[PDB]
Amino acid sequence: SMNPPPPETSNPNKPKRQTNQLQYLLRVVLKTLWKHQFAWPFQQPVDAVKLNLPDYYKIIKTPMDMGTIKKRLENNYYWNAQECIQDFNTMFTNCYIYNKPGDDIVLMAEALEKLFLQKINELPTEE
């Protein structure tokens, strides 16, 4: 399509672990953000066709979204929490790259990011 293949959510040869922090990221961090009133644009990969953003994947070369992150967590895709947190960071950063300060979508991302920051502050220690 005008859309690239979505980011993988499984990769059999990638090393992975379950850690208490990754569990936390799924059951609390992801879950909380997912139910937020501003979550909906971020619950799936950007559909450049449907949303009429033909320039999106000209600009964003490392796409990420909470839908991909959710599956990745459900599929135990990650080696550690930092890998997952990086995916969240990429998603926010993409939004701030593609869009303008004060855009509705940026306001939504900003709200989610500050909530994200609160929630990872409460991340349980790891070993």
Ligand X SMILES: O=C1CC=CN1c1cccc(NS(=O)(=O)c2cccc(Br)c2)c1
Q: Is the CB of 28 or the CB of 53 nearer to ligand X?
A: 53
Cα 74 to Cα 48: distance, rounded to the nearest angstrom: 26
Minimum distance of ligand X from residue 102's CB (angstroms):
12
- In sequence order, what are the residues at sequence separation of 6 or more whose Cβ sits closer than 8 angstroms to the Cβ of residue 84? 22, 25, 69, 72, 73, 78
CB burial readout 113-127, b (16+ within 10 A) else e: bebbeebbeeeeeee
Minimum distance of ligand X from residue 78's CB (angstroms):
22
Q: Which residues within the stretch 80-119 sit at the binding site for ligand X (CB under 6 A)?
A: 95, 98-99, 104-105, 108
Q: Is the CB of 43 or the CB of 80 nearer to ligand X?
A: 43
Residues that bind ligand X (CB under 6 A): 41-42, 46, 51, 53, 95, 98-99, 104-105, 108
